[PDB]
Amino acid sequence: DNEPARLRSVAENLAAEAAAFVRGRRAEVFDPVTVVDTDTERLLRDRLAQLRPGDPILGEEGRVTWVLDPIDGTVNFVYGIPAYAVSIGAQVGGITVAGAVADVAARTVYSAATGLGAHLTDERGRHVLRCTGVDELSMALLGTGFGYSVRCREKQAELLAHVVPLVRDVRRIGSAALDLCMVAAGRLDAYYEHGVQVWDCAAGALIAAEAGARVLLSAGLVVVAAAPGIADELLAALQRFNGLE
Amino acid sequence: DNEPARLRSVAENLAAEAAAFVRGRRAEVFDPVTVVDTDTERLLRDRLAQLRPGDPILGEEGRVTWVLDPIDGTVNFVYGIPAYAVSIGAQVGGITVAGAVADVAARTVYSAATGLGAHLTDERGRHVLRCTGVDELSMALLGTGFGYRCREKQAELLAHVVPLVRDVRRIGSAALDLCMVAAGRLDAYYEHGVQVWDCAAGALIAAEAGARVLLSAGLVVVAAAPGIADELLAALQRFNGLE
């Protein structure tokens, strides 16, 4: 119809399809990432033309709006680090109503829709996602990334050094979409990145949110996603050093 | 016999076995990591008693010497991030002659022996490992970790090198980082404070893949594609980290 449940199914299906295509195209090809990225963007646009005729598409290169990234984690893709993803978000008035992130190398798909919860789908079927119940920020495993391009990186690194001793450990994986899903699944306790494009966090953000996580999205965005027991304590430490703004 | 080729086979086999056991034990159990870590240590010690009778064993908790870590990446193991490894190194006089690192969730095994090259073994059979041919440190993908107190200084140091490199990866397993360098999935790796049983095997593997590797109670580890090693060592010294 156009309800969240319907929107997430098309999101799940397209994500899974596109993952299969990326997985296959990468093997053939191996600029080279530009090729697969474009090809997969084309696949998604065409499939959306047939499944969702009049719907707007905001791509990485250009009523519900489909916000997408065929390959989030392009560095990872080029190096063969199994941590790149297809992200498909369904937005209405700038709010994400449904979404799906496909972990290409893992052959799994995370998805969610407003009010309906977040699930992970793999060979063993579909599972409910729930973030962790950490209380002490010194017990939290935090993921981060460098957002945008080479400009303004050392400051972000400087900021992180300050938060490093306040937390259990840090992870830097190379994919914003996948970090948001880890938080949802409980593989990270929180995630923080400064400068994330909308098409890389829109889907994941919802997924983490529907998994009970605290999520705030302040040309990129500032993203904070954390288990609820630890969100305030983390936001304070970040503000304390200027990062959540 | 006791030659590198023989030493690496027993390393490969033990790594593969132990990975299978960890993979199984983790599913049962899910302190909880302490349990699996000990159990797997016991498996390796017993198997080494039967395959390599008189050989000394330096474990994470205690003529060739088998240096080993049943689960490198214990935080990863606990959270379900597929990046923990079994590491088995064969040392003679403190020098690593052969080694194997099993990537437990990937179901793959990396191995090497002095003069015999580094290989990766997976479903598609055995492959030769070679690190990348990067020249510009600004083009290099660098992996890091923290080894152990004092963490903020290490982070401070990294912020300085961050703009000199393509991007940074922090995965949670030194054994796996060294193997990623060998495979070409990272261009270099740097960590300050790495126990011997987490880097001995990987260090050899990266080295046998053509990487520049130096090991300065833990150790300082630098492993990099050759075309970029000097340039990286300089930047590190320039901020005090390779010491």
Author numbering:
A (entry chain A): 5 to 34, 54 to 85, 98 to 253, 260 to 286
B (entry chain C): 5 to 34, 54 to 85, 98 to 183, 186 to 253, 260 to 286
What does the article say, verbatim?
The structure of M. tuberculosis SuhB was determined by molecular replacement to a resolution of 2.6 Å. The asymmetric unit of the crystal lattice contains three independent copies of the SuhB monomer forming two crystallographically distinct dimers: chains A and C associate as one dimer, whereas chain B forms an analogous dimer with one of its symmetry mates. The dimer observed in the crystal structure of SuhB is primarily mediated by helices α6 in layer V and the β-sheet in layer IV, which extends across the interface. Due to the absence of divalent metal ions and of substrate in the active site, the loop connecting helices α1 and α2 is disordered (residues 35–53 missing), as is much of the loop connecting strands β3 and β4 (residues 85–96 missing). The active site of SuhB is situated in a cavity carved out at the N-terminal end of helix α7, sandwiched between layers II and IV. Due to the disordered α1-α2 loop – referred to as the 'mobile loop' – the active site in SuhB appears wide open to solvent. Structural elements of the active site required for metal and substrate binding include the IMPase signature motif 104DPXDGT109 (superscripts denote residue numbers of the SuhB sequence) between strand β4 and helix α4, the 82GEEG85 motif at the 'tip' of the β3-β4 loop, the 209G [ST]AA212 motif in the β10-α7 loop, in addition to Glu228 in β11 and the 234WDXA237 motif in helix α8. All conserved side chains forming the metal binding sites or contacting inositol-1-phosphate are seen in essentially the same conformation as in the human/bovine enzyme, with the exception of Glu83: as a consequence of disorder in a large part of the β3-β4 loop, Glu83 (h_70) in subunit A points outward rather into the active site. The interface of the SuhB dimer buries a total of 2696 Å2 of solvent accessible surface, calculated using the PISA interface server, or 1348 Å2 per monomer. The present data support a model of Mg2+-dependent dimerization, where loading of the three catalytic metal sites in the active site induces ordering of the mobile loop, promoting dimerization likely by expanding the dimer interface.
